[PDB]
Amino acid sequence: RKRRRHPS
Amino acid sequence: PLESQYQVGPLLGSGGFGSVYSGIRVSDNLPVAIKHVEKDRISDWGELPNGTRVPMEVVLLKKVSSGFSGVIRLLDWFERPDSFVLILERPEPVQDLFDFITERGALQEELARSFFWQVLEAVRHCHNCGVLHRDIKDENILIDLNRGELKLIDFGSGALLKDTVYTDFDGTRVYSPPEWIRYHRYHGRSAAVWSLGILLYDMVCGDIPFEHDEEIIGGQVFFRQRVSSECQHLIRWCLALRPSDRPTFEEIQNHPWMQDVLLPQETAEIHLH
Ligand SMILES: O=c1[nH][nH]c2c1SCc1ccccc1-2
Hints:
A: little secondary structure; 0% strand; B: three-stranded antiparallel β-sheet; 9 helices; binds 2,5-dihydro-1~{H}-isothiochromeno[4,3-c]pyrazol-3-one; kinase (chain B); protein serine/threonine kinase activator activity (chain B); phosphoprotein (chain B); proto-oncogene (chain B); apoptosis (chain B)
């Protein structure tokens, strides 16, 4: 499945 | 004289943190990273042992930059009309832990143990210096591929460490604890332990366990990869829903999964070369 970065 | 003392190179990245360029200190050809921060895009400000008003990130980097550690060191910094510019260490060669895990998949437990141990030493170091990172995640960890050393980066969401409640937060939501989702309050150490549980699952399973608030507050941990019982126990302990049920940093490093850790040099030679 799709793995993504996550902003802050 | 900033522009005429560091040779500016290619952009390394940009985002909610600013814009980071590769660079070389002309004085001695040392690899550096040059980070720019728009003044208008700054939330928390502080003052150093000079009274000069600076972004909190500079305050925190100075508190932790003393000596050697698994934290990125702030070499220098300048003020400009609309921005601040930060001169930081740049390992070479380097890759951040998010890209490393994407390329390699779920890491062998031996490698996850060495990596996780180094992160624990680095976070302990920050807390010893009165600094709370508040955005521990694979994206904010650099791997010096040759030395096998991990470096913690980006204090742009950090705070001074304190024992009372925090009711503000601007870090990564998928690494934030359920008491922040449910009640908009948390304590610093226990929330740090939660993010470290997210990080360790990420290392051993190939990605983070939770994407959605419901999963975060649900506190059910499904393992999508083969993971040892001792390591599953440590992860579930770090991710206890009640903050007071979470382990201390001492209890994490005394946990039986954390024994016989590889040295950095061994980690490079076995897993990184
Ligand atoms: O706060 C930061 N964001 N990005 C980086 C930093 S410290 C140096 C660094 C070196 C190499 C690649 C990225 C970075």
